[PDB]
Coordinates of C-alpha atoms and ligand atoms in Angstrom, one line a residue:
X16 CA 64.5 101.3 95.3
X17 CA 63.8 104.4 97.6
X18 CA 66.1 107.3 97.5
X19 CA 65.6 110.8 99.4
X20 CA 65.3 114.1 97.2
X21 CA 69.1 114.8 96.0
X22 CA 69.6 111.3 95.8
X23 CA 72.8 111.5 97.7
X24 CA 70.8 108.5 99.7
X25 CA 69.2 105.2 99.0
X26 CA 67.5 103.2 101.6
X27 CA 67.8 99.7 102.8
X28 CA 64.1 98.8 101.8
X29 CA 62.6 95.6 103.7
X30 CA 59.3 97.0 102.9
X31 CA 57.2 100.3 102.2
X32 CA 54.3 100.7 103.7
X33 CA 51.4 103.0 102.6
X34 CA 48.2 103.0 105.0
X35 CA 44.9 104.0 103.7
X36 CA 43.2 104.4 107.2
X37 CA 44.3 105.0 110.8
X38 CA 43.2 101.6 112.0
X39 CA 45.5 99.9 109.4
X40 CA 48.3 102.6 110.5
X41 CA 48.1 101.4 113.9
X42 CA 48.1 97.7 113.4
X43 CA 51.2 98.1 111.1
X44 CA 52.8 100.0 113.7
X45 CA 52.0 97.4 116.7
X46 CA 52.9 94.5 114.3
X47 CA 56.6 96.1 113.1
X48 CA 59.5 95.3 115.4
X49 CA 61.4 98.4 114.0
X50 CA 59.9 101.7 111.9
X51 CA 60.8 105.0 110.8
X52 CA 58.2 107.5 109.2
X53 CA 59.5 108.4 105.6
X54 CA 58.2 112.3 104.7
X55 CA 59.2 114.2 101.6
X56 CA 62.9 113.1 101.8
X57 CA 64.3 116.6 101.8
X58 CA 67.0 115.5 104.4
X59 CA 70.5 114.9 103.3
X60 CA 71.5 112.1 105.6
X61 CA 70.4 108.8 107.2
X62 CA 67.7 109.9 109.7
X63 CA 65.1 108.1 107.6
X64 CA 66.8 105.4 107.2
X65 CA 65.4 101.8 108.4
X66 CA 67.8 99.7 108.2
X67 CA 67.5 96.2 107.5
X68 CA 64.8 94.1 109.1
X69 CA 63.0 97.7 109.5
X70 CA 60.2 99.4 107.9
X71 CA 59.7 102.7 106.0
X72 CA 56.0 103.9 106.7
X73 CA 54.6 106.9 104.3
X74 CA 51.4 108.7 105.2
X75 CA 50.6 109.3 101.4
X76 CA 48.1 106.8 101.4
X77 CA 46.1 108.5 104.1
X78 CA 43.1 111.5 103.6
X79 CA 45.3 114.6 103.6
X80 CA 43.6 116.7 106.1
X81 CA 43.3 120.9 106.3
X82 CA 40.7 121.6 109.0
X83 CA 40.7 125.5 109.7
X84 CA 38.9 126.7 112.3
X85 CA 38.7 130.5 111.0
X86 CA 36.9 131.2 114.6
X87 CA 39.8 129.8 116.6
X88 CA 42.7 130.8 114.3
X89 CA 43.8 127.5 114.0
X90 CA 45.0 124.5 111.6
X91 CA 44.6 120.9 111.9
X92 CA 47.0 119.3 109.6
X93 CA 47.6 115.8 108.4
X94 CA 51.3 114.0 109.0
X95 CA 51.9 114.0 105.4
X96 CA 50.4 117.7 104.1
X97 CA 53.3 119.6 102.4
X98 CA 53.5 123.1 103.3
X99 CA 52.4 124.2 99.6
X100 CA 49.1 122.8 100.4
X101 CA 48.4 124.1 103.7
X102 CA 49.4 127.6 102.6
X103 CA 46.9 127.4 99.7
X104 CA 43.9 126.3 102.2
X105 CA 44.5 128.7 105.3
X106 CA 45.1 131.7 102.6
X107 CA 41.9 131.0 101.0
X108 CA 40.3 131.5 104.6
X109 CA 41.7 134.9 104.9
X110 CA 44.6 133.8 107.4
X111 CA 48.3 133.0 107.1
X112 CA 51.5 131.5 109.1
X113 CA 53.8 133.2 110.4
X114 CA 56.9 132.1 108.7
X115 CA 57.9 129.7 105.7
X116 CA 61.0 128.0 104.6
X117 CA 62.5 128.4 101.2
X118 CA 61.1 125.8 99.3
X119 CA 57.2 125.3 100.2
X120 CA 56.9 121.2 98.7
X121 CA 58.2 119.8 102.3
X122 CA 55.9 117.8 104.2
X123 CA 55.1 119.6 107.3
X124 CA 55.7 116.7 110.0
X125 CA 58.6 116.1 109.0
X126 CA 60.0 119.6 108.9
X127 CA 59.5 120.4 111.7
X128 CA 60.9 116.8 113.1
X129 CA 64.6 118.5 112.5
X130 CA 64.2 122.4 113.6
X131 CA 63.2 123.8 110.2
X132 CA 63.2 127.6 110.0
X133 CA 62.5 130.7 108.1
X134 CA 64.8 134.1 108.7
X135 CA 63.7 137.4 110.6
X136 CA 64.7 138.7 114.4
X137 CA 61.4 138.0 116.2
X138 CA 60.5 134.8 113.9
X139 CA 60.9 131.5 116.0
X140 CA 61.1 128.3 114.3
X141 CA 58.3 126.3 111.7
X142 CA 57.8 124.2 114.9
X143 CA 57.2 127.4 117.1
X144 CA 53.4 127.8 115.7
X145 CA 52.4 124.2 116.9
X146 CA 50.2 124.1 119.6
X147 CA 49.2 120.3 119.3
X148 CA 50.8 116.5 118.5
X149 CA 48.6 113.4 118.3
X150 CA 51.3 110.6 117.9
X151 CA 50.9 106.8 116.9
X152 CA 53.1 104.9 119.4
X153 CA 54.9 101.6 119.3
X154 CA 52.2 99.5 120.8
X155 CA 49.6 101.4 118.1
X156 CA 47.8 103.5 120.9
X157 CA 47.5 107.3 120.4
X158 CA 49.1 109.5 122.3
X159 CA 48.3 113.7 122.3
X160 CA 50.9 115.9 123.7
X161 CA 49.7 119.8 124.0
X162 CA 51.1 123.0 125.0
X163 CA 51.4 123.3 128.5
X164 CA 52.1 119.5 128.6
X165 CA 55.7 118.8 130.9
X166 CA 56.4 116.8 127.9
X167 CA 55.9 119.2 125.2
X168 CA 59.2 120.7 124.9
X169 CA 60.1 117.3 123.1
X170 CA 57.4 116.2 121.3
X171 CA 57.6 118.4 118.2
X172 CA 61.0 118.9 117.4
X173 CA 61.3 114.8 118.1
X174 CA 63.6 113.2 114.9
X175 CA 60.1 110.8 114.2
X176 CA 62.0 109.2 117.1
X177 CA 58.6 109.3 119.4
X178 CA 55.9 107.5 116.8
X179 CA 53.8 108.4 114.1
X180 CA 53.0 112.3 114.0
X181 CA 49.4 111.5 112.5
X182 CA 48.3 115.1 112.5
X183 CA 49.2 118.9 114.0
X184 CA 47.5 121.4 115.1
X185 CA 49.0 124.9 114.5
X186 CA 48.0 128.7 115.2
X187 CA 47.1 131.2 112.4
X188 CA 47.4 134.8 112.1
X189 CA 45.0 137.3 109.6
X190 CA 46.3 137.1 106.1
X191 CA 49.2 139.7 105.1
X192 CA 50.8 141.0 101.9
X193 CA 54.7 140.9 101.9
X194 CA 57.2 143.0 99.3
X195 CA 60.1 141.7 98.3
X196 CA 63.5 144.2 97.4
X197 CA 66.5 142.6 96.7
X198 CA 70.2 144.5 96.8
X199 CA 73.7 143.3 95.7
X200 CA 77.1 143.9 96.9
X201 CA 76.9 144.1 100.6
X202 CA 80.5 144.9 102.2
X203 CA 81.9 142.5 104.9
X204 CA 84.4 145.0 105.6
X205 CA 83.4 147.6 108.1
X206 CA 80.4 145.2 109.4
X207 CA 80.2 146.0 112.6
X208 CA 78.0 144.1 115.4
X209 CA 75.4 147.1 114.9
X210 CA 75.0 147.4 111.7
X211 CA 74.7 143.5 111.3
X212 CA 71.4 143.7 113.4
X213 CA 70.2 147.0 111.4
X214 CA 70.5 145.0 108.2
X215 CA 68.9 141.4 109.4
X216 CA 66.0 143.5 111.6
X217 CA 65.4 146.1 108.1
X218 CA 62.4 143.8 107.3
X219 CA 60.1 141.1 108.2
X220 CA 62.4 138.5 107.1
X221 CA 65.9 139.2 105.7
X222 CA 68.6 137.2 103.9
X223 CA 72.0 137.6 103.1
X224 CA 73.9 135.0 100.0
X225 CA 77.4 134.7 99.2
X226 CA 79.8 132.5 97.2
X227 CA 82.8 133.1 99.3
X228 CA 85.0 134.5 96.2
X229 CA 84.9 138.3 96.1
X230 CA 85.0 139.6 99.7
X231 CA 81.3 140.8 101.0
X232 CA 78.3 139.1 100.3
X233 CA 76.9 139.3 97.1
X234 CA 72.9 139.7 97.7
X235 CA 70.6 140.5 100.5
X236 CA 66.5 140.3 100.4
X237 CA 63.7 142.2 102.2
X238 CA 60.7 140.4 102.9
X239 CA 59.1 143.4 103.5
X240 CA 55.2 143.2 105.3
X241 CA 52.9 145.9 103.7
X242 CA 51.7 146.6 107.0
X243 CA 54.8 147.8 108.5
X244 CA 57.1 150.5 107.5
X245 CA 59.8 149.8 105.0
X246 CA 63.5 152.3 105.8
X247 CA 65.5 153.4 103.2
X248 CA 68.0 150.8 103.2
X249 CA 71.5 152.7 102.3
X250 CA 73.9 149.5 102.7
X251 CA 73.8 148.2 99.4
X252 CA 72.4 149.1 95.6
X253 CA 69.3 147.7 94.4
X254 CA 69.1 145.1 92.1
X255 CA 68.6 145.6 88.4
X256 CA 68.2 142.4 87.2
X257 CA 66.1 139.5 89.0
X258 CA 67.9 137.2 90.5
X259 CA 68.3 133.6 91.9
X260 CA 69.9 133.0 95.5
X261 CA 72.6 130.9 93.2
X262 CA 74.7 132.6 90.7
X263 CA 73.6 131.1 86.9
X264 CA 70.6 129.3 88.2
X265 CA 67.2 130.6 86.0
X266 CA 65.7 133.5 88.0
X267 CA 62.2 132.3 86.8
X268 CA 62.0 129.7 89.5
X269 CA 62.5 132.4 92.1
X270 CA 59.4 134.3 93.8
X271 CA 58.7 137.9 92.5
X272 CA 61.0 140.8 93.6
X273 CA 61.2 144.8 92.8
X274 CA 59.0 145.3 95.9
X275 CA 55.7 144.1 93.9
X276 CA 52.9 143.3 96.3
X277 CA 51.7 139.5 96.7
X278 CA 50.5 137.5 99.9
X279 CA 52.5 136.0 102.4
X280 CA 53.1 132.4 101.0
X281 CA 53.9 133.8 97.7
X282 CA 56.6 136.2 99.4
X283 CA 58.2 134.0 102.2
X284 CA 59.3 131.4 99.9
X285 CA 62.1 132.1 98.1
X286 CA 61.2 129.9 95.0
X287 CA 57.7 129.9 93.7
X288 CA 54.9 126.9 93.9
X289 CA 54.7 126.0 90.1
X290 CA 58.7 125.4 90.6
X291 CA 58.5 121.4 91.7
X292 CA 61.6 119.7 91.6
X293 CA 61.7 115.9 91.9
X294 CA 65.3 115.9 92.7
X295 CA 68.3 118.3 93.3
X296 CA 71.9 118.2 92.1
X297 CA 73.2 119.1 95.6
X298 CA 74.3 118.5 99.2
X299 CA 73.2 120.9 102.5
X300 CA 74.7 121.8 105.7
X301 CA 73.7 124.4 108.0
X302 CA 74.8 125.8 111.2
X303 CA 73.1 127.3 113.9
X304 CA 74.9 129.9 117.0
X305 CA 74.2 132.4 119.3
X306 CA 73.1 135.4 117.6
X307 CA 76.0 137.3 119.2
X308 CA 78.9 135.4 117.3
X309 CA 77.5 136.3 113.5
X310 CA 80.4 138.3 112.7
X311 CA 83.2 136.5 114.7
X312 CA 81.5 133.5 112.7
X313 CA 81.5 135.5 108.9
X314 CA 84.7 136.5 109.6
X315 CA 86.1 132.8 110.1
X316 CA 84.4 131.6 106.8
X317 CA 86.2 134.5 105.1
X318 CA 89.6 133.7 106.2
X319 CA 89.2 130.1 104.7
X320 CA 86.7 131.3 101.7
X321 CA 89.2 129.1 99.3
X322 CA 88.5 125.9 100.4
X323 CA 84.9 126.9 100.3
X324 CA 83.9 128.3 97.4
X325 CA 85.3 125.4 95.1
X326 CA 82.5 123.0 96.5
X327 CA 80.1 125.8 97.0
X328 CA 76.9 126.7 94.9
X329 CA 75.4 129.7 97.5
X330 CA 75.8 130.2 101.4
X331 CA 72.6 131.8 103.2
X332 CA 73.3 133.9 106.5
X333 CA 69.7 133.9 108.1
X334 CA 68.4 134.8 111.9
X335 CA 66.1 132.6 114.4
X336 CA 64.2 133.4 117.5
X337 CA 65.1 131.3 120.5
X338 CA 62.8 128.4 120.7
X339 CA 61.0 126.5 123.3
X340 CA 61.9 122.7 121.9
X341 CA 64.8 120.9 123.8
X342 CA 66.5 119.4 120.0
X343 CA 65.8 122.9 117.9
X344 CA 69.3 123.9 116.5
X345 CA 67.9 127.2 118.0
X346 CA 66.7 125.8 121.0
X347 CA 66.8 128.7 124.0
X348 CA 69.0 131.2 122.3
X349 CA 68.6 134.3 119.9
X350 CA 70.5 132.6 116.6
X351 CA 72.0 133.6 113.6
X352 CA 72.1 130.4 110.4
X353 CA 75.0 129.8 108.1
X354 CA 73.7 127.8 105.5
X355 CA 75.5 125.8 102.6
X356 CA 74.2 124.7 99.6
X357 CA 77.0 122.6 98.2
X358 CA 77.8 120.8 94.7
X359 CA 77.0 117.3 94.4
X360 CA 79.9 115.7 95.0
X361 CA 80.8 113.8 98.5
X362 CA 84.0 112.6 98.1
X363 CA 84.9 117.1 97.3
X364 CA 82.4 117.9 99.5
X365 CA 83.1 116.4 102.8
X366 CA 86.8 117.2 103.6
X367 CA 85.3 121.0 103.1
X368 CA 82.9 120.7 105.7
X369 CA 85.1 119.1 108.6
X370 CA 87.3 121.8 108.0
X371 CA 84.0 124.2 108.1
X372 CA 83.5 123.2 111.2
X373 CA 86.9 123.7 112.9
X374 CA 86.4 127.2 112.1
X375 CA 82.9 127.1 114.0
X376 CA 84.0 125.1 117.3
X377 CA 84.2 128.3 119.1
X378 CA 81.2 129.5 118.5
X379 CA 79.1 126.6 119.7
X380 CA 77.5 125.6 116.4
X381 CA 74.8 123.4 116.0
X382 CA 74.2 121.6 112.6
X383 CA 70.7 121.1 111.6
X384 CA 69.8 117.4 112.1
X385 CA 68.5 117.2 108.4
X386 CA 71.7 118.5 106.7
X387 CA 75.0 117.1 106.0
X388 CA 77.4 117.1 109.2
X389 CA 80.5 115.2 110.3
X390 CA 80.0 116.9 114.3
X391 CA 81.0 113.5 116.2
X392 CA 78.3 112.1 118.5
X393 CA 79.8 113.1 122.4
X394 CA 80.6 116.7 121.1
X395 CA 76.9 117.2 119.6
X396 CA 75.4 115.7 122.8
X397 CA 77.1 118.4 124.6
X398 CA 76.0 121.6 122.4
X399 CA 72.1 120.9 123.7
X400 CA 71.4 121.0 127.4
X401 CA 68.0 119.0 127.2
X402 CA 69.1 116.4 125.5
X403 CA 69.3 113.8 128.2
X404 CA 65.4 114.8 128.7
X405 CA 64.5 114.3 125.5
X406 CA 66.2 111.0 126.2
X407 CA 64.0 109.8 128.8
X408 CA 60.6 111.0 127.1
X409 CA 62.0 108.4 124.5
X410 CA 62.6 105.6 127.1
X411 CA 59.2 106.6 128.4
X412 CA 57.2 106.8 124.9
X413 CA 59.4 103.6 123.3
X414 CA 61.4 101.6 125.5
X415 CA 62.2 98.9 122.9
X416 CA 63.5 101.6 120.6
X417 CA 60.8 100.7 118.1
X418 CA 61.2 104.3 116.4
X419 CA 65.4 104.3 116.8
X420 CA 67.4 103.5 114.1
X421 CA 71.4 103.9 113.9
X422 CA 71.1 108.1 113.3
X423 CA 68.8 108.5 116.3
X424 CA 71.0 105.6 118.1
X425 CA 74.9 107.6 117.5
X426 CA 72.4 110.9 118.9
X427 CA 71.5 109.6 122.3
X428 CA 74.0 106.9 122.9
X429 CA 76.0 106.8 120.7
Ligands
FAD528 C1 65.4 119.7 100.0 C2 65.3 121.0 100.8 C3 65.4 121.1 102.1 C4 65.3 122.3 102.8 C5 64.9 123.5 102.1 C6 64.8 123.4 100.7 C7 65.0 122.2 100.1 C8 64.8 122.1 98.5 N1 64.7 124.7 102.7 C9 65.0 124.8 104.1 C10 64.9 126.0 104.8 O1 64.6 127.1 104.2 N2 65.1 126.0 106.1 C11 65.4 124.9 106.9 O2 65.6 125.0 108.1 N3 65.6 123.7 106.2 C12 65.3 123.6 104.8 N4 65.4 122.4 104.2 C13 65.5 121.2 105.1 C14 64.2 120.4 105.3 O3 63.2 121.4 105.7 C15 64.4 119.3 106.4 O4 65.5 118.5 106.2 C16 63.1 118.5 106.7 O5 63.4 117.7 107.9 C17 62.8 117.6 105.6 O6 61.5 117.0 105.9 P1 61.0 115.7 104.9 O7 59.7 115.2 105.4 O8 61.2 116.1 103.5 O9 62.3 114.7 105.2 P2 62.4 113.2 105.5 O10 63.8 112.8 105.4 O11 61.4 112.4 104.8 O12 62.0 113.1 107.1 C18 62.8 113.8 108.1 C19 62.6 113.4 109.5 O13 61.2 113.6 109.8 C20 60.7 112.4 110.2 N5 59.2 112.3 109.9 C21 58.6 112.7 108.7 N6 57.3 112.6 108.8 C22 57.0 112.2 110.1 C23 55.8 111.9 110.7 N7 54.5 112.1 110.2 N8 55.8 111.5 112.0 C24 57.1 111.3 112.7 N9 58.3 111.6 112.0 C25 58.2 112.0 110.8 C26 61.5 111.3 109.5 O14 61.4 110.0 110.1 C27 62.9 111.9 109.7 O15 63.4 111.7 111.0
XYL529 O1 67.8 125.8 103.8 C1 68.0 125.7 102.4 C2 68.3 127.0 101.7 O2 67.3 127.9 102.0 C3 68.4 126.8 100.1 O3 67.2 126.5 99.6 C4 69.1 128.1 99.5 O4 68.2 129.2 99.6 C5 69.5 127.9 98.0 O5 70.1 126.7 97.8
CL530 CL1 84.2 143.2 101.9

């Protein structure tokens, strides 16, 4: 029995498969009538999901490849590499990424399959630093899509709904040091659309966390680079204590805060490596909008902050850079992220987040295809305006659907 990471999810399991070389990769893959690529389950739906009669491939079995080329700034990356991993390897050669997302144990195809992101102003998407795809196809030839390629802008950010992502290739920057300060008691009241920005743009990256019962938002964090100047930041008081993003959680998972330096990969995150989960007691959403709506947005998750917070563990408000790929949540548009990290329970859970997203219609909210969401499918195909290309680049790549299965199918058709 295969279930993803909060076990909210158990998969119809025909077979497993677990190649130990490309060759037997792509004779599975020609062979199989119906596939979909199974990563480190940290989605909270049925995008992996076979269904019967289909197969669930892994790339565990494979060589898990880290080739830098320290001359080039790049990173060639196997499907199945977690970001923990790569992190570890490029840091080692004196160079970094430029952004992480909170947890680093994710494999990296498959985060940035659903629009994974990070937080800060000027910091596009995980899939943003990809420069390269070599996919496996249905009829087990290889297939390498590039920057600059027409196709491009739907071959990264794809739902595994294109082939086998077999590696990436990804550019580097010179390694940094990052500070993290964290604050409490941030006032929604008198937020204004100023201020908002002055607070998210304060440092490199910058979160804010609330659990919708006491008005404001109870923390914010600076991820501050050492090679940029840090502002006094008078909004909020600093922390005394530190502290974990939800309220009675232990703070010893948590990367290190009072502004003590550390590299990049042991700042971004917001829990540390040695912290490795095998499953979670929760459920996701997250929702993704034009930058400009954050506090006509905040200000509609107040006013129905008691049917929230019941069901609620911690909300993170985070920022995006527009992106170039046609199915990122933040796909061509400056965005601000409303995250929810919700208790376990579905039957509580999902009355909450249809009403959630009443309150969000007017702001053109996408939900992030790896998270829970109840958007039906006509309304979500009209929030993305290259959908119908990514459409036909999956006709093109797959006409028998080989790599569709009935998430991907309610998406496009549906
Ligand atoms: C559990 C979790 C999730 C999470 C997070 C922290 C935790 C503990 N922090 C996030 C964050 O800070 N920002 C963000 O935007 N999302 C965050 N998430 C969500 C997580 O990153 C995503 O849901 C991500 O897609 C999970 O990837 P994973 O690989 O674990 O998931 P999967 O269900 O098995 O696969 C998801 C899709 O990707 C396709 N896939 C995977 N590998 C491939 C390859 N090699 N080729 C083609 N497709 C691939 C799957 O088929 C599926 O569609
Ligand atoms: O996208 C997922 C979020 O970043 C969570 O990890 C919160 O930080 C805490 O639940
Ligand atoms: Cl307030």
């Amino acid at each position: 029995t295969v279930t993803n990471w909060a076990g909210n999810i158990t998969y119809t399991a025909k077979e497993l498969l677990r190649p130990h070389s490309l060759d037997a990769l792509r004779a599975l893959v020609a062979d199989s009538a119906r596939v979909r690529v199974l990563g480190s389950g940290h989605s909270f739906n049925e995008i992996a999901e076979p269904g019967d009669g289909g197969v669930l491939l892994s790339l565990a079995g494979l060589p898990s490849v880290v080739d830098v080329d320290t001359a080039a700034r790049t990173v060639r990356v196997g499907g199945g590499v977690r970001y923990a991993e790569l992190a570890r390897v490029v840091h080692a050669r004196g160079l970094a990424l430029p952004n992480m997302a909170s947890l680093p144990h994710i494999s990296v195809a498959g985060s940035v399959a659903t629009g994974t992101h990070g937080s800060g102003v000027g910091n596009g998407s995980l899939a943003s630093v990809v420069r390269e795809v070599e996919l496996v196809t249905a009829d087990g030839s290889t297939v390498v899509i590039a920057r600059g390629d027409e196709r491009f802008g739907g071959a990264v950010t794809s739902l595994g709904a294109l082939g086998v992502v077999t590696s990436l290739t990804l550019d580097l920057e010179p390694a940094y040091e990052m500070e993290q300060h964290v604050f409490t008691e941030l006032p929604l009241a008198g937020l204004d659309p100023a201020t908002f920005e002055t607070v998210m743009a304060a440092a490199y990256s910058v979160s804010l966390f609330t659990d919708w019962r006491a008005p404001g938002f109870r923390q914010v964090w600076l991820k501050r680079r050492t090679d940029r100047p840090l502002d006094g930041f008078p909004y909020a008081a600093p922390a005394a204590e530190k502290m974990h993003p939800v309220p009675g959680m232990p703070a010893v998972n948590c990367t290190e805060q009072f502004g003590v330096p550390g590299p990049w990969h042991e700042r971004l995150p917001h829990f540390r490596a040695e912290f490795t989960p095998s499953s979670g007691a929760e459920l996701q959403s997250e929702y993704l909008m034009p930058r400009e709506h954050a506090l006509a947005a905040l200000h509609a998750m107040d006013a129905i902050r008691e049917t929230l917070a019941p069901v609620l563990q911690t909300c993170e408000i985070r920022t995006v850079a527009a992106d170039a790929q046609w199915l990122s949540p933040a796909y061509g548009r400056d965005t601000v992220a409303a995250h929810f990290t919700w208790v376990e329970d579905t039957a509580a859970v999902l009355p909450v987040v249809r009403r959630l997203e009443e309150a969000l219609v007017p702001f053109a909210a996408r939900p992030h295809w790896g998270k829970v969401f109840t958007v039906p499918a006509g309304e979500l195909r009209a929030l993305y305006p290259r959908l119908a290309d990514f459409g036909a680049l999956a006709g093109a790549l797959d006409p028998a659907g080989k790599f569709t299965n009935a998430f991907v199918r309610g998406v496009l058709a549906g």
